[PDB]
Structure formats: structure tokens, C-alpha cells
Amino acid sequence: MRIVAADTGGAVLDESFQPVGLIATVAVLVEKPYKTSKRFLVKYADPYNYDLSGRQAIRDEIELAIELAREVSPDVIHLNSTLGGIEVRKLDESTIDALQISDRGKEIWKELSKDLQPLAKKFWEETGIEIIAIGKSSVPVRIAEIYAGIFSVKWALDNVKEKGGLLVGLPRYMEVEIKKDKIIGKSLDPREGGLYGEVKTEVPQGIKWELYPNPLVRRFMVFEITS
């Protein structure tokens, strides 16, 4: 199988570890043996002008996934939303309310449907590629999530010297390592079968970085970098 998946992840934290804004949206192409991605795109947001209550992330996600899909022609697109694998192009008010998701889950998706359902329908008529809301059960999504963490670290690397101090909240139970020329992100959950990512970047000088648990959010790590 060849799958394109997209996720938004990584957050700027204040000194009380409260999230300020999300950082990276990543679309990945995942192929056998489905442990990583060698082909991917990234779109950075502005964490300092980000609405956490708003759900722009998923609109960026589905767009970025399509952009990658039109180039690599995958079998399917995985969107990070656990709706039981329902096709976005089939998302109308009728089908949303019939899902066994929270009542709030239903509320949010009726508004997204105005743009995303026709968008998925046109793309399906073009390419025949479905865009399914599968969320947590999907490995390409989790791999995309790992890369979202890595690009958040890269974002921190590229932006540490203008802000002189950054706390980056990583996605769930993943760690990062920084080599001379690349960032390595790895899932901390061995049950996932060895999921990982790698992104080439120039690592700036005069910086020190640390990785430690978020004391307020168990199984979430914090990436801290200074000058």
C-alpha cells in the first residue's frame, strides 16, 4: 500500500508548560514496511498568532495531503480524525450525526463539511483517491505526527536566536535526537513497531538543548533549547 497522511503537531509552550500555538503541519508518503517516510511536505504556522480553539490545522492538513497526493499518487489519503474511516467526500449533516463520536465531534464537522466535502469530492472525481478520517488507528498518521514533532524541533532550531529561548511541546511519547546534519525523531512506544523519522537541516552553533518529560502531561516530552 502507498498512503499519504497529514497531521498538525508540536506546540510552543510558555514557562507554565501551557500550549501557546501549534507549529508544524506535515504530509507524508508512507510505503512498506510502513515504519517511516522518505517523501514529505511541511507547512509552518505562526504559534504566536494561532487559535487553539479554532481548527485551522485540519484545513491545512487536508490541503497539504492533497498537494502531495497529486504528485505521488497514493492509494488513499489518511486524515487525522477518528471517525471510523469514513470518506470525507461522503460527509454531510446526515452522516455526521450517525457517527458514534461525541456530540461536540458532530458539531465541529458540520462546519468543516462546507469546504472539505466538496473538495474531497472534486479530488476523488479527478484522481479516484479517497480521503478517509481514520485518525488514531492509522500508522501513516502517527508517522506524520512524528514528523510534525521533528519539524517543530527544526522550527525551534531555525528560530531560537531571534527569541532567545523556546519550549517545544512534542507529540505523544516521542523523542528527538540532533546530529550534525539531521534531526531524528522516534516513537517511545515499542508497541508501534519502531516508528521513526529523519529530516536534514543545518544545526546552528552556540545552542544547548534538553529533552525531558512534561510534568503536567504524562507521556509527553518537552524540547528545550537556549543560547
Residues that bind a copy of itself (CB under 8 A): 1, 3, 15-17, 30, 32-35, 85, 134, 136-140, 142, 172-173, 175, 188-195, 210, 212-219, 221
**Interface mask toward DNA for 116-155; x: CB under 7 A:** -------------------xx--------x--xx------
Judged by CB under 7 A, the stretch of 158-166, 190-198, 200-208, 210-218 that binds DNA is 210-218
Least CB distance to a copy of itself at residue 114 (A): 28
**Separation of alpha carbons 76 and 210, rounded Å:** 37
DSSP state of 87: E
CB nearer to a copy of itself: pick between 108 and 217: 217
**Separation of alpha carbons 91 and 120, rounded Å:** 9
Give residues preceding each break in the chain, C–N over 2.5 A: none
- Is 91 among the residues that bind DNA (CB under 7 A)? no
Grid cell for residue 168:
517545544
Helices then strands, each counted (H, E), the chain: 4, 12
Residue 52's binding partner, choosing from DNA, a copy of itself, none, with beta-carbon cut-off 5 to 8 A by kind? DNA
Task: Please identify which residue in 3, 7, 78, 147 interacts with DNA, judged by CB under 7 A.
Answer: 7
Task: Confirm if 27 and 68 have CB atoms less than 8 A apart.
Answer: yes
Task: Confirm if 199 and 181 have CB atoms less than 8 A apart.
Answer: no
Task: Please identify which residue in 27, 42, 57, 146 interacts with DNA, judged by CB under 7 A.
Answer: 57
